[PDB]
Amino acid sequence: AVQKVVVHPLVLLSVVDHFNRIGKVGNQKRVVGVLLGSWQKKVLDVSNSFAVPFDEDDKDDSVWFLDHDYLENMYGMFKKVNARERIVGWYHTGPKLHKNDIAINELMKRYCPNSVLVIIDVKPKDLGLPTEAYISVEEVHDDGTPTSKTFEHVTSEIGAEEAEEVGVEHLLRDIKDTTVGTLSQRITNQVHGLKGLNSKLLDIRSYLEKVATGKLPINHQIIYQLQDVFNLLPDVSLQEFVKAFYLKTNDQMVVVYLASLIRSVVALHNLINNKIANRDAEKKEG
């Protein structure tokens, strides 16, 4: 079915520009619309969409309505201009999901066998690659609950297209690209420890909270399982590198050797040729 989704900045903006539409008139809830997907393969892609007036009451927390006269005839519009573009699901800006979201997908399953919902974010904050994606399946449960319909997270990734980077990538103009090979990889390293070890502390504090409160989630078992896959090397005191010690510097063996060999001859190219051309102009002029 649906494994991963591809969200373009163009269709994501179609949720963002509608945040100006109903944001000025208010009032409650969020921006919600129906998603037009482009499915060429198991990997899902999204090009365009259409935003529909939508509201969700608080009291009355289970009340939701799409406008389906907007959904029907406007489909024949986008279908007439683009035959490949069709509705794969819906979307909204979240930020989180209330329990009522179970009924939005099951209603529109007449349009698509499986409707994928995309939670987006109009204001970028944290922690990383934004928005979100969910898929609607039924896993029931191990405890014996009646059949449980819970949306499972779908990994979301941004993607590009020809001719769409004209105006999009133009307006920024302030970015330095990249530079690959010097700063590009090292800034990630400073962040790879930051973003790597912050979720380490956020989860290890919530995993300690388990014993305290919030149990379940037990989880189970996914938590410790892949944590023990992380445990191929801990790495703890001290590094257990006795076999990887001589191999540590042995990987730095040729990297330092070439860096010593290149800088020697690069100098011979830089130093000699500079002295030659310099004294040819300098002393022959005066």
Partner: protein, 191 residues
């Protein structure tokens, strides 16, 4: 003619699966939808009528429209199975009424409750006075079986309108064999 948008709420609760309303509440409430939809046709063409499933979770597959053709199609294979939920079904018509393009149509709701609901008298009076602030006049018609000589829904109807406001009126359905056309006789005469 009176201007308003009448949102009829079909009852999918598990207690609608018997035949006390002849021949069966599925076809009886169908005939109960037949008489209200054909009456609005005799009343005003501009009145648009949708349908909503109260039990389980509220979902509307038919956009609010004056044509009852799609409504009569959804009356078949409705599968009345689920737990009745009332409180969420009051504003469920009001939210579709807030999506109305024309604002000249009054807000009117008719819901079918055929199952006993667990509710506190304080919960129904808060929704009552909430509709007073929203001016919505909701005509409820008791169906199925419920608390004998229904109190809650009666207090929900009584406290919903006042001075006059002509209005919201509840008609208690007798637990006896009858045709669905004979049930609506009093409510359709005087709402």
């Amino acid at each position: 003619m009176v201007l308003e948008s009448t949102m009829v709420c079909v009852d999918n609760s598990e207690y609608m699966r018997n035949g006390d309303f002849l021949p069966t509440r599925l076809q009886a409430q169908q005939d109960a939808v037949n008489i209200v939809c054909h009456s609005k046709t005799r009343s005003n063409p501009e009145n648009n009528v949708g349908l909503i499933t109260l039990a389980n979770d509220c979902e509307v597959l038919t956009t609010l429209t004056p044509d009852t053709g799609r409504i009569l199609s959804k009356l078949h294979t409705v599968q009345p199975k689920g737990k009745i939920t009332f409180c969420t079904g009051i504003r469920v018509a009001h939210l579709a009424l807030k999506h109305r393009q024309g604002k000249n149509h009054k807000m009117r709701i008719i819901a079918f409750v055929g199952s006993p609901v667990e509710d506190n008298e304080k919960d129904l009076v808060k929704l009552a006075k909430r509709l007073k602030k929203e001016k919505v006049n909701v005509d409820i018609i008791n169906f199925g079986e419920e608390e004998v000589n229904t109190e809650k829904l009666t207090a929900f109807v009584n406290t919903l309108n006042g001075k006059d406001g002509t209005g919201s009126h509840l008609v208690t359905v007798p637990p006896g064999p009858s045709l669905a056309d004979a049930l609506i006789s009093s409510p359709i005469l005087a709402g």
